[PDB]
Paper text:
GBS expresses three structurally distinct pilus types, each containing at least two antigens capable of eliciting protective immunity in mouse models, confirming a key role in bacterial pathogenesis. The three GBS pilus types are coded by distinct genomic loci containing features typical of Gram-positive pilus islands (PIs). These islands, named PI-1, PI-2a and PI-2b, encode three structural pilus proteins, corresponding to the major pilus subunit (backbone protein, BP) that forms the pilus shaft and two ancillary proteins that appear to be located at the pilus tip (AP1) and at the base (AP2) as anchor protein of the pilus to the bacterial cell-wall. Prior to the discovery of pilus-structures in Gram-positive bacteria, the backbone protein of pilus 2b (BP-2b) was described as a GBS surface invasin (named surface protein of GBS 1, Spb1), due to its ability to promote invasion of epithelial cells. Here we report the structural and functional characterization of the backbone protein of pilus 2b (BP-2b).
We solved the X-ray structure of a fragment of the protein (lacking the N-terminal first 184 residues) encompassing domains D2 and D3. Both domains revealed an IgG-like fold organization, typical of the pilin subunits, and the presence of internal isopeptide bonds. Pilus Island 2b (PI-2b) has been commonly found in the epidemiologically relevant GBS serotype III-ST-17 lineage. While the assembly of the well characterized GBS pili 1 and 2a occur following the classical model, the pilus 2b seems to differ slightly: the pilus 2b components do not contain the canonical conserved primary sequence of the pilin motif described for pilus polymerization in Gram-positive bacteria, making difficult the identification of the key residues involved in pilus assembly. Finally, by site-directed mutagenesis and complementation studies in GBS strains we identified the non-canonical residues/motives essential for the BP-2b protein polymerization. Using the three-dimensional information we generated the single structurally well-defined domains as recombinant proteins and compared their protective immunity with the full length protein in a well-established mouse model.
Numbering used by the authors: 185 to 286, 296 to 470
Write the structure that this text describes.
Amino acid sequence: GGKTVDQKTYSVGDTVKYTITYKNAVNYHGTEKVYQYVIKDTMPSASVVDLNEGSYEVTITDGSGNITTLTQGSEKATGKYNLLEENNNFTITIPWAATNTPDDFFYKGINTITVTYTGVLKSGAKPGSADLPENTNIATINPNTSNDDPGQKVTVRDGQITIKKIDGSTKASLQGAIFVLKNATGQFLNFNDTNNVEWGTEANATEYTTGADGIITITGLKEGTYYLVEKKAPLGYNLLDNSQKVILGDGATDTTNSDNLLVNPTVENNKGTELPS
Ligand SMILES: [Ca+2]
Ligand SMILES: [Ca+2]
Ligand SMILES: [Ca+2]
């Protein structure tokens, strides 16, 4: 639709670039002179996507491709837009004519209004591919003082890996194993800032321990190929030599309800000699 984001999925802490596009901007609406367009954007909670205030680029593109880049201000004048930011939301008002009644229009023909801006994904975002109103924003664009536009929505997305650690023979769930997560580019996950996934050295990696249920949950990752690296085996088990590949997104296995952003790899462990005896 008319509201889009730059990536199909994100990791927590990533910059999300949003684009709002409105292609029907002309000088009359009904028989009424258009003297402004109002763009209102209601974002998710800032605990989910935190708007970067002041990040806007506002343009008008005419039918020939000519671009006018607008600048911020309250004056009713060509080349301007007014901004109000409150509560993680914003409203942009673009004056369209020098006066409100019949001329003194600033722009001619059929124009496209584009607003680009950014936000930052935070820890409250929900993972997966389902209907997620909490991850969704809505932008409306209306002439003059109308509020009838039903708006354009987009949902930011991320993924989750639920690791289950078992004994390869008995299939029992095993507590106390320690893993780190590696990406496809040689780096290790540091998720110590709960609002920001980071990738770096192994020494700086976050260590995850399998719980009483054998599980580790890592929530808030971009699609891609990851590798589960065992740092400590459960008590009595041999340390696994090699990592286990886990795909999140296209190509995923072990999905929950066919959702390739909710994956459930099982890692098998091998009892060490003393434990079979
Ligand atoms: Ca130009
Ligand atoms: Ca109305
Ligand atoms: Ca980051």
